[PDB]
């Protein structure tokens, strides 16, 4: 009987989680369709490259920051496995003794 | 007592979802389903006891204040997975944790409430192991601990 | 990964059109819409996280590099329409995909992200959904996949 | 200036790969944060006992 | 930070296009060094080979402006002052006065560190305008270098 | 004893460095600087012994074969910073592990090799040595670690 209780609980929880996942997919995809038809309605003559021209320098700066942040994350990872190895060795030696 | 506000909101969405008429009433079958789907383990005997208490309240339907009161009653309960894991270990004839799955389905059809063929087969292919081959109910206990 | 030039022109067109003026910096409220302009679905939780991350810059201003981060972060996850079909038809107890329009409206009203019933009615008219007759899942799936 | 524009388009293309790299580095960073914490706790408990 | 103004990056792009007669944007190792020095900050030969390996990661040793972006970003963290360099040249002079013969400078630049080409030696001798017999300050050349 | 190719490469690099003329025959005074900057830990008496060996070889000038041989006899020397810390402590009059920079200068210069005042100041400089205050022994530990 306790096994029955556990089985019912698991079944209903799985159905519940499936329901939330389905409802989230449905609402998000409905929003996607409505925004897509909004965009289709909003179609107009053409574009202007000059808007992209100003934003190119901003993309330059963000790329600079990208390589930077890559470098700091790499250095942090270096210090990270340094600390990892230190702790591993110290604790292994202490535990063995 | 008083429950968490986020818990109250979750109970509200569960009540709205399991209600199909949108009125705000929950039937006995929907009551059992929501008890099982909240996360806590409802006993079949305790499920009938809750149904009887709802009948004492009357109308055979659940209003939101009644739903909150039964939420308090349900959270008053507790579930322990070590105890059910030990019960499963005793349940296995070998007791090693590996047991025939078809025999499992046959016993839970015989002993305890009879699981429906749909539920039995859903358990079978969720176990991801052949019925004749040994299955580990400890895996099921672990996946209950995960939730 | 690598993407064609025509799609690049598509994003440039989207950024130009979503700008009501010419100065740029479309409001963050249209932010998500811009992402949905690409036929991709950012979840509301992802939407608010992206908004919080953007707020470091603040001022409610969006930029093309930030939009490139938008599309790449969304590209991190990929989904198929068959999963959407399965999600739609698993809610139905019958499983044939036929559900009453009242059921779908209740589903919309029960959402964590509140969806206006006006938009639900608009989608019903778009798909010619009948309230009395259960709507076939493929009927809406056609323009779900058309997107 | 045509090569100028073509290389601008390539630059605009390049951004996404960099962003993906940033995200994957963040994922690895948080993962090995978690590994460090778990290992440190386990080792401390074992040494104490 | 220190976001580059449009004029600077535009001029760098113009120089890159000018140097590459092809215009396809492909960068070779010699082109790598050319743009590396065109940046104007101090380039490192070990860093040169490191970035050459980074280019080889793409393959074929042919790459365009995104490599230029990577190198400029990696070099931005490097900050140097010409006054610091000219004051650090004092360690070159054993006497420390700074008035030293160009012959010893030639010998050092030929032999010390990474070997320098003989044509480079002749170019420096011609450009420094410093007589070998006369002890002349290297700082006189460091000033015209500081002009850049 | 023959070392690796990189060892001899570094040795010949220093050889070209201190050879202001590039002749290949470097006098004893500059050879001592070569030895000290190369990585060795030579005693002044041991330096003079090397000078006597060179003079027996003749001309008081070093050649790279003789250079490599005296490498082979010199790499065998190794010193531990604990001994130098004990030396500084016994130099300290109070014995608490802290000796004044002026006192250290006087103690080191009055006896032993008469090291010049400018290089004593160079000791004080580049090591954060407090002239009037007592010298931190950790500074000396780091200085010997950098050799």
CSV table of C-alpha atoms in Angstrom, one decimal, chain A residues 1-20 23, chain B residues 14 36-39 41-44 79 88 108 111 113 115 122-123 126 143-144 147:
chain,number,residue,atom,x,y,z
A,1,UNK,CA,0.0,0.0,0.0
A,2,UNK,CA,2.9,2.4,0.7
A,3,UNK,CA,4.3,1.4,-2.6
A,4,UNK,CA,0.9,2.3,-4.1
A,5,UNK,CA,1.1,5.8,-2.5
A,6,UNK,CA,4.6,6.4,-3.8
A,7,UNK,CA,3.5,5.3,-7.3
A,8,UNK,CA,0.5,7.6,-7.3
A,9,UNK,CA,2.6,10.5,-6.1
A,10,UNK,CA,5.2,9.9,-8.8
A,11,UNK,CA,2.6,9.6,-11.5
A,12,UNK,CA,0.8,12.8,-10.5
A,13,UNK,CA,4.0,14.8,-10.1
A,14,UNK,CA,5.2,13.7,-13.5
A,15,UNK,CA,1.9,14.7,-15.0
A,16,UNK,CA,2.1,18.0,-13.2
A,17,UNK,CA,5.6,18.8,-14.4
A,18,UNK,CA,4.6,17.8,-17.9
A,19,UNK,CA,1.6,20.2,-17.7
A,20,UNK,CA,3.7,23.2,-16.6
A,23,UNK,CA,1.8,25.3,-20.7
B,14,UNK,CA,-3.0,23.9,-9.2
B,36,UNK,CA,-1.0,13.1,-5.4
B,37,UNK,CA,0.3,15.9,-7.6
B,38,UNK,CA,1.2,18.4,-4.9
B,39,UNK,CA,4.2,16.2,-3.9
B,41,UNK,CA,2.2,11.1,-0.3
B,42,UNK,CA,-1.5,10.6,0.1
B,43,UNK,CA,-2.6,7.3,1.6
B,44,UNK,CA,-5.6,5.6,-0.1
B,79,UNK,CA,7.2,11.7,4.0
B,88,UNK,CA,11.0,-2.0,-0.7
B,108,UNK,CA,1.0,-4.3,-6.8
B,111,UNK,CA,-1.3,-6.5,-3.0
B,113,UNK,CA,-4.6,-1.0,-4.7
B,115,UNK,CA,-2.6,-0.1,-10.5
B,122,UNK,CA,3.9,3.5,-17.9
B,123,UNK,CA,5.9,2.4,-14.9
B,126,UNK,CA,9.8,4.4,-17.3
B,143,UNK,CA,14.2,9.5,-8.1
B,144,UNK,CA,11.6,10.1,-5.4
B,147,UNK,CA,11.6,15.5,-6.2
